[PDB]
Amino acid sequence: LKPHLHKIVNSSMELAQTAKEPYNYFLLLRALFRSIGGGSHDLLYQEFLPLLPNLLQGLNMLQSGLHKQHMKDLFVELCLTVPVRLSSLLPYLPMLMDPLVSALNGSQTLVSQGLRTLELCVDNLQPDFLYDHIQPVRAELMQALWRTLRNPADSISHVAYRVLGKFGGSNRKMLKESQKLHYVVTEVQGPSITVEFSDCKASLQLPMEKAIETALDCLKSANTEPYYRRQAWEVIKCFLVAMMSLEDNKHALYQLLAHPNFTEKTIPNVIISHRYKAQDTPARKTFEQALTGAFMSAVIKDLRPSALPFVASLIRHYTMVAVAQQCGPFLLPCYQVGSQPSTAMFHSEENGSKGMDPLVLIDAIAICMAYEEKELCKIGEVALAVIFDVASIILGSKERACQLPLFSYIVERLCACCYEQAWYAKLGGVVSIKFLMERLPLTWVLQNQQTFLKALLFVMMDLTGEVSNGAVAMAKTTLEQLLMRCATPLRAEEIVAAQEKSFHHVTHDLVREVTSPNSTVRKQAMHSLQVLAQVTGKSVTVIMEPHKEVLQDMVPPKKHLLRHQPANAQIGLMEGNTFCTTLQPRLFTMDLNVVEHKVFYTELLNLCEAEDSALTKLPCY
Amino acid sequence: MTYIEKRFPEDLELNAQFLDLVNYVYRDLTAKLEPAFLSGLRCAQPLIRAKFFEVFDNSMKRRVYERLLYVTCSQNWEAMGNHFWIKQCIELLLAVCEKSTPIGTSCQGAMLPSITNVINLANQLHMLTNRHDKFLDTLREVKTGALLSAFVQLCHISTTLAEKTWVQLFPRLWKILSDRQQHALAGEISPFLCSGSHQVQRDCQPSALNCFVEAMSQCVPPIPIRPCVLKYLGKTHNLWFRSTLMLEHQAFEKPQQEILDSLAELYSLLQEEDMWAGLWQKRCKYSETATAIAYEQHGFFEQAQESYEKAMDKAKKEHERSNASPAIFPEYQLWEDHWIRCSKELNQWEALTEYGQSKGHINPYLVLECAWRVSNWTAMKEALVQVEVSCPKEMAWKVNMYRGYLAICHPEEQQLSFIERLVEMASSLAIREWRRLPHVVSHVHTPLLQAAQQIIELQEAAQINAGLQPTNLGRNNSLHDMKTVVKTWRNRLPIVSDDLSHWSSIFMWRQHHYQGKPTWSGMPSSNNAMLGVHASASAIIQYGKIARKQGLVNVALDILSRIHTIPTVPIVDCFQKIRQQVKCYLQLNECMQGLEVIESTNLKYFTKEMTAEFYALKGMFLAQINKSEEANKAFSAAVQMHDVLVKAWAMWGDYLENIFVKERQLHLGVSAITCYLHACRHQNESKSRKYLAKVLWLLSFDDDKNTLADAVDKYCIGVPPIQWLAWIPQLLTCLVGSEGKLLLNLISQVGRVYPQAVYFPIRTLYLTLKIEQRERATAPMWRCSRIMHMQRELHPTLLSSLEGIVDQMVWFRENWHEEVLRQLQQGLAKCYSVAFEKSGAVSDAKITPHTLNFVKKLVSTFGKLKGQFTTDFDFSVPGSMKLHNLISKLKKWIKILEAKTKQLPKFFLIEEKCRFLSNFSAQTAEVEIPGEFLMPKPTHYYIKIARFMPRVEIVQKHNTAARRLYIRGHNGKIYPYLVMNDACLTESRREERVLQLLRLLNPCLEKRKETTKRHLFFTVPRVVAVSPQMRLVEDNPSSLSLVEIYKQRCAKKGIEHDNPISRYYDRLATVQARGTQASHQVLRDILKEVQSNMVPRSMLKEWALHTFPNATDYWTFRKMFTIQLALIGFAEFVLHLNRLNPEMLQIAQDTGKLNVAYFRFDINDATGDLDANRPVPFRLTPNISEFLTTIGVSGPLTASMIAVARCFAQPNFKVDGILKTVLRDEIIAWHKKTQDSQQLVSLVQKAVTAIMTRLHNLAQFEGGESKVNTLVAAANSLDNLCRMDPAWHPWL
Amino acid sequence: PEWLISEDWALLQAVKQLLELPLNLTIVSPAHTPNWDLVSDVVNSCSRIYRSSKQCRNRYENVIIPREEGKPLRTSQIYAQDENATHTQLYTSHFDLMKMTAGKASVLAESGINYDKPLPPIQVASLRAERIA
């Protein structure tokens, strides 16, 4: 096994990033470490040493990031338990410490694993050296050591207490970072439910902040018994039908929604945005938490029969509220023709909407998308269709319902999921882009064409590290379809103008990204033009011709001293130059005689001809 | 039922349901089946639970009052001790509601509006609307009983919900009860709390009583609870801080002393000695007790012990003539308890053991602790047996250990075979109590963490004796079991903050084995006797080493006197003895004795390295006394003998500098510079800033021919550049000034290794000089450029990334709306400050020339069409005649723009408007977190940049809007940085200066005990500036300034935060208009009336109470708040800093840390007078004091200020060097602003000597309380407050 | 183990915070379950040696119950009569115990050092470099 032992680990780590299901790749290492660990420790241990820097740095990066609970539990386990004895691990010890604090939190088997590694490290590293390496993490490590004493498992506590004793005085040394305290920022009454007794017919208002959160936590939990799941659903349901005011019926409702004007008048062009959302006040925070509880209670079996007909009928209600609040007939003043995305459209404690805003539904839908358990995307995707369906029916036309100000928030909020650091949160965004693209009118997609393009590129750019359980692979496909959906030639003047304008903007962004240092986004930007070159009859250079202003100062590198940029950018400048020139129309003829071209051409030459290490190994290199 | 439950916990379904059928038999007495019926109420199967509930629900009236009595009095909760039985109580009461009424909610504001509600504010469709009405029709059928049934069930599975429900429930339904019912209910509640049924529930963490007692406290009509029981409940049910907090409240407002006794004991139990001390100083009858406590509170246990003994005899004279005066007994008990404590800290273990076993009134507990420390085991065994019978408390963990001590060090012959159970039993028992302590670890937790170190030592101590047994003695494995464990002990020590008594515990216990070890080797080529004696010799020296570090020198001499008894010591250990002995005399006719030991020792034998250190001590000791010329040769011989001893080099330099400061002898200065730099050479990182500070300080005396600088340049080699990182701003101030070309050879070496550390400062300086020059390349600018030039050649990738980051920074500057509003806020503050200066004179006053330029500059940037035509019209002239009329105009325009900026975006993504930051990644370039190099941290501990989070939030800072961009370090943590953009670069640089000082002083606090014992540090934020204008400040969210607290509750109130200042001036004008000048009394009147009408005394307490509902969180936040304000208060006074305006103090809600918003030295513009003598020495104010008055101000604050002041007073910490260097740079900046040579020395030297005057004046300890008590009393005295600037918000 | 008088009054008052004379005459109408730990806690405020909860109950049920019943002076009446003299006598005796306890250079020449003449650091610094050479 000594031969191609590096290939197993080196490939496993790099493959795990791109692969859709990395869990097997990391489980492979866990199997490897157990087998090698304590069973074959003559040559593999020596053969393992070269792997330690990248491997520990790798594994350290993964646990530092945020993945699914079961995934994270494995990661902290791999950072520890490596088949390297006490010695030869000290140089990389700082990288191991961050897992150690993580281990002391979480699963019991991890806590014991964390103490087990900490226990041995305490005895063999002499206090002064070990404590120094604990300084970066001591603020949270010690608080974890103190906390684990209170844990119920006696074996965990006794071991935790023993190590604290071994930490002679360091266990009680003053902490630069004090223990974080729990403070309530909002001094307002949260959501409550009227309760009346027979005693002098007096009434109370028992707060529901914990109950709704507690009920939701039960639905999140993967091992709550079915009875309490049903009760959790009942608490959430009974609360929603409490905050939701039932003050309309049939004739009163029909006349408002059968009105002229809002079915014929131009829909007001108001842009919503959570940029101006002051803060999630406790009601809105609870209301959003209550809704995501309703959405989750719909997906899980043995509760869908009484939930899906509820959430489905509830989603239709909120959209009817949103439309009636921001459509032709009356609309609140915050949605008038020339208004701006003020805070009046979000619930707030000083200038809210004097009543919960319907947009909290979109927040609940977005949070369901970003939930780690991706099964919730399906129920959320149902909601997006339902609000669109009600909007189409109530406004009398598809493209009209899409012009509604509500969808300006949906595109913004769901796209925001692509800017979260968790891969699952990002994947929730990309899936949302795919759904909206394929179920919405072409012209509207053109209106939000660029917004999706930028978000998709960010997901790919952001995930150059451990990519995902298949996100960029999903992002690239969605990006490809997005250009194909929009760039496909048609036929009315209105649509033609939008496509010509939208196509103009998108190519501007793609050309800008040709030379970008990020390899993942760069190559796709290179490839995204190719699909455009095929979708339409226009040649690649004809597509890139108008936006020469962008790349103009780089294809010819403008003698930007070719050391003041890192290696990654130098690849982008060279790769962008290669792609730009290689096109058979060959934009930006790189004439040697012209200045700042001979320089670039000579530099890449000397770079290639550099034979020895010293000349090849420059400070940038 | 008793047997079935325990044996088979999975088949109770058949039985549990059976007892439900027994409900019929009870009516048709078998009452003894209650402890199974109650176990059926909890169960785990929901179906059975409801079946048992119906009989329980049936058996009582459907009245809220009756059920409350039933839960309190009628019911017994003993049967279900392990359960959190409050769940049933929540279920019991929630079952009395009206389950039929349709669901609703009082908070109509939060309800989602109905579809048709928009009207009131003024085919596919019909099927949908018709279909929808059915859905709404179903909702109308939901009844509140549906929620309560599900609500109640949800509690049973989640204690956290149950715990929060009862606290939110009982006070709410407590209102429902009529005042008659509440009266009777309160009568039953008091006996209920102290009932014995809850006794079973002490161990379980969320104790049912803990949640119950927490709930009642919120009841709006206060429920009277005896202080005696409140102490008990706090002690047992982990309810510590709610009891003390609740006890404090009544103690403040309200035979009225039983409260203090209960409160006093709890503070002692919590080990909050400083808070405990404050309480007793207020109530102590005898003046002796206050003197004793004040001494004991800080150390000097020699004085405190005597002050107690003085009190007792004087009290003894009282007894023979007077009666008992029952109230005095707790005071007498205090002296006996604390005279013993001080006796322990004094190492008077022999006397205590003799005292403890007196003829009568024996004290077995006292004998237990002290008897074993001396070898009097026979007394130990006797004491242990008679205390085991009454081992009453947590001590059980302590008692169990002492069995091991007797087991190991048996009076005749040990067994050490069953000890494993003993140590394990004690360890488990110790953890048991730990579970009973508060949530946040604090001083109350110290004994357990303090003990954990010694409980383990007992276990591995048994391993020592096991090896000594002849059965396994002499074996190599056992011998190496002896060696390693002894080595482990030598490196595992407590911290200096630990009381010397515990330090004895670790070492006295270790001493026994260091004496058992020689015995086995005394039987043979057995050198292990040398190892054993070496251990005891080193251990006793180490144990006595701290006694000096603690300030108890006299006992330290005694401990170092013990080693003489041991027959032989390794010569290396004896060198520590003399070094520790000579150090002891150095810290205190004492010269003769010190000179006796130094001369007598080392008659003819020692090695080179140890001789030098010894001879080094001679010079420093000689230097103290007048005889000094002999010290020089003592250093010369010492330094040159070893030539690599930092102490010789450093101490020698101090002598040369001490002489050279007078007579300005140039050749001596280079002698001082050479010594200092060489000392810092071998020394790495810390413990060299003190020496470097001198080198930079002495560099100011350099003449035109830069001899000292040449001396620096010649000998600044070898000193690793890391040591310089602390002095980058000081170096740059030298580089920009004259003779910089000499230092440029040094900075280039510092930058060559830490490019990010110098580039950001150097970039600021060069760009700062350029703008300075452009106002009207120069050599200083050329010097800065040369550093960057070469510094770009190396790490070219890193520098490009840095500049790229700064280039993108320009996009974070606030828009015009915020920019102008910032000018208004700045202008208004200056007008108020100018306005106060013009007070007393005509209140109308006149607009100052400086104010005109700002307003004239304001219209220039303003002159937005709708606003424009109004502002220019309103500001028809840049201030017409009246200053106090102008502020009204600004305030109106403050409100206009403040609302205007309220609608501005709170978000804007990085990828938008700036691409480099978003495209930045770890592989782009290794760049450390901004401000990482501000302090040369010795260890690696450097966090790279990995990703600029794509979202930046726009936030308000005191009087400006700043962009907060979140960084993600390579470690995965998120560091929120706040991009501060500001003009007036000269002021900004000064603000960083004081922060450098506070960062330089922080290591000072750690070393000593009386400061480390209180967790004292300056929490200086990390600020690195990259511009002449903008800078990055490490802002942690949730930190809101004190003034913002006033606005928050002011906004809730029906007033505006600026009403106090306006009322102060207009009220002053009315009296001034009549003709009478502003007298002192009228200043008190306006302050008093404002404090009683618009700014209530309890403003800050109200916010803290509502923001920290959890008791444990409130106290710790208050304690940390009080401690931090002490350092701020001390720093604002001793360092002669700018006054602490309300907007300056930044309170961190998450941790309680207070960091002042950019302090700065208060130097007179005309001259470097350094005038900081405003009426109140430091901000104490009513509201802040109201947070802490009775104890917090007295005990913690006064003690905290004294502890810090004494810490800096230590001659060992060369604060003179630190202040002189930093101030020198400050003075240079002052000179440039006001418009070199030795005249600089006069300003800085006179300034520092002014600072040390305050430091020593308020640090010196007299025969009683220190001078701090006077100023803090003067700080909050209304006489000084009313005289302060109204903009300072003295009322606040 | 030394018995006191004021501690008996502490026992009485502590019991008055819960039940009645025959401790649980009926544990009072409701179930309040006397808490001897609390009674032991309060009595310790006026003592220097812990009165364990188990032993605290025995003293109440052994001597206090008969003495309180009477039908010697009542425990309330002895305490007033004593004038707290015993307790003062106790601390006065303790104070005496504490007070009574409270009563108790040619080596340099052999190393090449010309100790008579100091060497300025400049020469010493230069001398240091030479040894490196």
PDB file of N, CA and C in Angstrom, chain B residues 133-164:
ATOM      1  N   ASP B 133     -62.621  31.135   0.324  1.00  0.00           N
ATOM      2  CA  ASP B 133     -63.489  31.388   1.466  1.00  0.00           C
ATOM      3  C   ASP B 133     -63.696  30.128   2.294  1.00  0.00           C
ATOM      4  N   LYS B 134     -63.706  28.959   1.652  1.00  0.00           N
ATOM      5  CA  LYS B 134     -63.777  27.713   2.407  1.00  0.00           C
ATOM      6  C   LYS B 134     -62.566  27.569   3.317  1.00  0.00           C
ATOM      7  N   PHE B 135     -61.372  27.831   2.780  1.00  0.00           N
ATOM      8  CA  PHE B 135     -60.160  27.742   3.588  1.00  0.00           C
ATOM      9  C   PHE B 135     -60.237  28.675   4.787  1.00  0.00           C
ATOM     10  N   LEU B 136     -60.630  29.928   4.555  1.00  0.00           N
ATOM     11  CA  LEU B 136     -60.803  30.857   5.664  1.00  0.00           C
ATOM     12  C   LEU B 136     -61.886  30.376   6.618  1.00  0.00           C
ATOM     13  N   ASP B 137     -62.946  29.762   6.089  1.00  0.00           N
ATOM     14  CA  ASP B 137     -64.003  29.249   6.952  1.00  0.00           C
ATOM     15  C   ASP B 137     -63.461  28.200   7.914  1.00  0.00           C
ATOM     16  N   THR B 138     -62.573  27.327   7.432  1.00  0.00           N
ATOM     17  CA  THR B 138     -61.956  26.348   8.321  1.00  0.00           C
ATOM     18  C   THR B 138     -61.160  27.037   9.421  1.00  0.00           C
ATOM     19  N   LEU B 139     -60.425  28.095   9.072  1.00  0.00           N
ATOM     20  CA  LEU B 139     -59.625  28.797  10.069  1.00  0.00           C
ATOM     21  C   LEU B 139     -60.506  29.378  11.167  1.00  0.00           C
ATOM     22  N   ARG B 140     -61.663  29.926  10.797  1.00  0.00           N
ATOM     23  CA  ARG B 140     -62.572  30.480  11.793  1.00  0.00           C
ATOM     24  C   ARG B 140     -63.024  29.433  12.801  1.00  0.00           C
ATOM     25  N   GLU B 141     -62.933  28.149  12.456  1.00  0.00           N
ATOM     26  CA  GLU B 141     -63.312  27.084  13.375  1.00  0.00           C
ATOM     27  C   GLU B 141     -62.236  26.779  14.409  1.00  0.00           C
ATOM     28  N   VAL B 142     -61.027  27.314  14.248  1.00  0.00           N
ATOM     29  CA  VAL B 142     -59.967  27.064  15.216  1.00  0.00           C
ATOM     30  C   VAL B 142     -60.288  27.796  16.512  1.00  0.00           C
ATOM     31  N   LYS B 143     -60.227  27.072  17.624  1.00  0.00           N
ATOM     32  CA  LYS B 143     -60.519  27.618  18.940  1.00  0.00           C
ATOM     33  C   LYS B 143     -59.263  27.594  19.798  1.00  0.00           C
ATOM     34  N   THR B 144     -59.171  28.561  20.716  1.00  0.00           N
ATOM     35  CA  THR B 144     -57.965  28.700  21.523  1.00  0.00           C
ATOM     36  C   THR B 144     -57.632  27.413  22.262  1.00  0.00           C
ATOM     37  N   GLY B 145     -58.644  26.620  22.614  1.00  0.00           N
ATOM     38  CA  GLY B 145     -58.375  25.348  23.261  1.00  0.00           C
ATOM     39  C   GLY B 145     -57.490  24.443  22.429  1.00  0.00           C
ATOM     40  N   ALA B 146     -57.527  24.601  21.105  1.00  0.00           N
ATOM     41  CA  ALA B 146     -56.670  23.795  20.244  1.00  0.00           C
ATOM     42  C   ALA B 146     -55.199  24.088  20.502  1.00  0.00           C
ATOM     43  N   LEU B 147     -54.852  25.363  20.682  1.00  0.00           N
ATOM     44  CA  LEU B 147     -53.457  25.716  20.921  1.00  0.00           C
ATOM     45  C   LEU B 147     -53.001  25.247  22.296  1.00  0.00           C
ATOM     46  N   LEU B 148     -53.809  25.496  23.327  1.00  0.00           N
ATOM     47  CA  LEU B 148     -53.403  25.134  24.681  1.00  0.00           C
ATOM     48  C   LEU B 148     -53.160  23.636  24.797  1.00  0.00           C
ATOM     49  N   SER B 149     -54.014  22.826  24.172  1.00  0.00           N
ATOM     50  CA  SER B 149     -53.806  21.384  24.201  1.00  0.00           C
ATOM     51  C   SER B 149     -52.474  21.014  23.564  1.00  0.00           C
ATOM     52  N   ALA B 150     -52.156  21.617  22.418  1.00  0.00           N
ATOM     53  CA  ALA B 150     -50.863  21.368  21.790  1.00  0.00           C
ATOM     54  C   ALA B 150     -49.745  22.090  22.530  1.00  0.00           C
ATOM     55  N   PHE B 151     -50.014  23.308  23.003  1.00  0.00           N
ATOM     56  CA  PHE B 151     -49.011  24.047  23.762  1.00  0.00           C
ATOM     57  C   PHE B 151     -48.568  23.257  24.984  1.00  0.00           C
ATOM     58  N   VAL B 152     -49.527  22.789  25.783  1.00  0.00           N
ATOM     59  CA  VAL B 152     -49.191  22.071  27.009  1.00  0.00           C
ATOM     60  C   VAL B 152     -48.342  20.850  26.687  1.00  0.00           C
ATOM     61  N   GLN B 153     -48.765  20.065  25.694  1.00  0.00           N
ATOM     62  CA  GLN B 153     -48.016  18.867  25.333  1.00  0.00           C
ATOM     63  C   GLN B 153     -46.592  19.214  24.917  1.00  0.00           C
ATOM     64  N   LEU B 154     -46.418  20.321  24.194  1.00  0.00           N
ATOM     65  CA  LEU B 154     -45.088  20.689  23.728  1.00  0.00           C
ATOM     66  C   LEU B 154     -44.147  20.983  24.888  1.00  0.00           C
ATOM     67  N   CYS B 155     -44.669  21.520  25.991  1.00  0.00           N
ATOM     68  CA  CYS B 155     -43.819  21.784  27.147  1.00  0.00           C
ATOM     69  C   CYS B 155     -43.223  20.495  27.694  1.00  0.00           C
ATOM     70  N   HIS B 156     -44.025  19.429  27.756  1.00  0.00           N
ATOM     71  CA  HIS B 156     -43.573  18.198  28.392  1.00  0.00           C
ATOM     72  C   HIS B 156     -42.320  17.643  27.730  1.00  0.00           C
ATOM     73  N   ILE B 157     -42.124  17.917  26.442  1.00  0.00           N
ATOM     74  CA  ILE B 157     -40.953  17.404  25.740  1.00  0.00           C
ATOM     75  C   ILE B 157     -39.772  18.366  25.798  1.00  0.00           C
ATOM     76  N   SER B 158     -40.002  19.633  26.138  1.00  0.00           N
ATOM     77  CA  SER B 158     -38.944  20.639  26.180  1.00  0.00           C
ATOM     78  C   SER B 158     -39.011  21.370  27.513  1.00  0.00           C
ATOM     79  N   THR B 159     -38.030  21.115  28.381  1.00  0.00           N
ATOM     80  CA  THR B 159     -37.946  21.859  29.633  1.00  0.00           C
ATOM     81  C   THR B 159     -37.709  23.339  29.371  1.00  0.00           C
ATOM     82  N   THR B 160     -36.846  23.655  28.403  1.00  0.00           N
ATOM     83  CA  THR B 160     -36.523  25.049  28.125  1.00  0.00           C
ATOM     84  C   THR B 160     -37.780  25.864  27.859  1.00  0.00           C
ATOM     85  N   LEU B 161     -38.706  25.323  27.066  1.00  0.00           N
ATOM     86  CA  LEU B 161     -39.982  26.002  26.869  1.00  0.00           C
ATOM     87  C   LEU B 161     -40.760  26.072  28.176  1.00  0.00           C
ATOM     88  N   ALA B 162     -40.763  24.979  28.941  1.00  0.00           N
ATOM     89  CA  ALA B 162     -41.469  24.974  30.217  1.00  0.00           C
ATOM     90  C   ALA B 162     -40.871  25.991  31.177  1.00  0.00           C
ATOM     91  N   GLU B 163     -39.540  26.067  31.237  1.00  0.00           N
ATOM     92  CA  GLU B 163     -38.903  27.015  32.144  1.00  0.00           C
ATOM     93  C   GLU B 163     -39.241  28.450  31.759  1.00  0.00           C
ATOM     94  N   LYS B 164     -39.236  28.754  30.459  1.00  0.00           N
ATOM     95  CA  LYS B 164     -39.535  30.112  30.021  1.00  0.00           C
ATOM     96  C   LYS B 164     -41.023  30.421  30.105  1.00  0.00           C
TER      97      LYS B 164
END
